[PDB]
Symmetry: D2
């Protein structure tokens, strides 16, 4: 119960490893905001967390949209009174589509690049002043070439966030991830900010 | 006069090294399309090229917009009958603004990332079928972390463009650039595609 | 306090940040082997640690020689009964002379690369079986491709509860180094930290 | 045809792609020094080139030994009157054994790194003053950080009209290599090509 009475937001938590991050946080006492572009999936995971004796709500977010990220943060405040943690796991999985850049749909490509590269930026901007008001916080960026973008972003934000007691780190890739993520959120990772963990 | 009766497009050619690329091409006999987000600057450079005994027109392009790139290509066809070369030099110079990602204007950041990372993609898509119809062509991408994006893009496009006799290469940084750029466009660089030149 | 009953070796600790690591380990309770190519400087640093109320000895080592690294490890085991930690900080002061690869003395060039790239390898090889008998251990490499060495060794050391990480560079460094050796860093191996 | 009146050295040309480079250079008119640690294989390849109507000799060289690389260069100069080109392709067949850094034989490990990383350095040092007397030259390194070596050497070789580039890997390779040596590649130095 490391995270008792803490508040964490996990983007892309409607499924996959994001869901496991959300569930693990709630298992250890945190109020979790289950944020996903898919509302129904997010609500499904939140409902199971609550049925399991946890605290969670779901929220629809478009991580590529700064205002949708802001709304996610304001909802978390209204529902839980503060924000301690943010896990930027939301991503667009493209796979072989990006092998055909000459013919790929422009709007798909733009959304893919925007979510995967800037998603963590908009969500970080949406939470960091609220965290500061809590006395500090911790953020984890889940990376996915181009993953140097999130590595670069993580180093930059780590410096900009200095003096707020806010740490920010990146994980670059099976419940060893979960263990690593929650560790990077916890107070035992106090010496760690601006670092990239290869998993 | 290596480029006599050839047709080349240079984006970001309203000033700086792009202007020198445009002027050099026209000096060696090519019909040059002087493409820039700034119409007046582009027209100024085109007017001097014509006054110097060259062949050139100016065109306004937003390289982040696939349709503006298409319009640039169609104008070149209409004006000169074909497209042999494309120099992707258009870029947003941000400098110290990107040291303040927490507070940077979102629309500025999006435009900066879109022009610098995807500009070469949209312009390449706009010209490659027209080049194919010419019997081949050559493209140079001018890179500017994040410059791995244009390096990656250049390698990917090089493979996708195979079998069209179209070469594509990247330059990553003072008229040695000009020399290198025109060489990479010329037939003597036939062995070179998908490569990055550190200048 | 924090490293009570632990035994740590620090190479290149006859001066600079290596000395600082050794002194920090000893003040937090560890028995420390001050290892350096410079035997006098190492002994002087060991003597000051002991004069300041820590436990330490000195050992002369050439980290470019696998047999010298072994002897360093055997001495530690004989002196303190085990090995828990290794900090690979040994380094040759090669700098702007690597701008002249066309004229640099070959034997110096090789020695430079050997110490700075292979030093950590030979010392890790010297201690890893001893650490395995203790039930695990932690290694920190001071950094280049010595990051790749750290990733590779981390995979090779698996199943032994031995962690190995790198720091790419003062109290910031000392703090990070001790953290990476501590049980708090149990989730961390095969990583490179920029301090 | 294309390399008429030119003199080129290819290391590691007793087999593999090294042989292919040497044979391609000779069929295009160059006098070629087939250099290899394996003296018999080098001589056999030299003999076939000459039997096929090219000009070549063999020389035994250990590219890890700076003095052996010098002797290779002196022989070339004495035999053909100058040096224009060097292709650094010498390499030791080390593979999956580098997955066992904890147990790999130290002397093999060092030799492996010496040949594969330093081979190109010692050979470049052996030829660059000779190339300068000829009015320039071109060097190709078969690739890692040996890219950094190529960038560094390119800067150090400035003002001599000597170009040095790297290829990171069959007829594709041969073509690229000969192009990088030709006068057509005059705009290219300190670059790494992926073929």
């Amino acid at each position: 119960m490391r995270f008792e009475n803490k508040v964490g937001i996990v983007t892309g938590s409607g499924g996959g490893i994001g869901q496991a991050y959300a569930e693990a946080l709630a298992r250890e006492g945190a109020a979790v905001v289950v944020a996903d572009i898919n509302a129904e999936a997010a609500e499904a995971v939140a409902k199971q967390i609550v049925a399991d004796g946890g605290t969670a709500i779901s929220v629809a977010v478009d991580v590529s949209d700064p205002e949708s990220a802001k709304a996610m943060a304001d909802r978390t405040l209204a529902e839980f009174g503060g924000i301690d943690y943010l896990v930027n796991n939301a991503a667009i999985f493209g796979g072989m589509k990006l092998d055909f850049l000459l013919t790929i749909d422009p709007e798909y490509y733009k959304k893919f690049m925007s979510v995967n590269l800037d998603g963590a930026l908009w969500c970080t901007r949406a939470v960091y002043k609220k965290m500061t008001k809590r006395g500090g916080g911790a953020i984890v960026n889940q990376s996915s070439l181009a993953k140097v973008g999130i590595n670069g972003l993580t180093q930059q934000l780590s410096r900009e966030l200095g003096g707020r007691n806010i740490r920010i780190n990146a994980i670059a890739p099976p419940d060893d991830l979960v263990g690593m993520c929650l560790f990077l959120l916890s107070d035992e990772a106090s010496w760690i900010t601006g670092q990239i963990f290869n998993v």
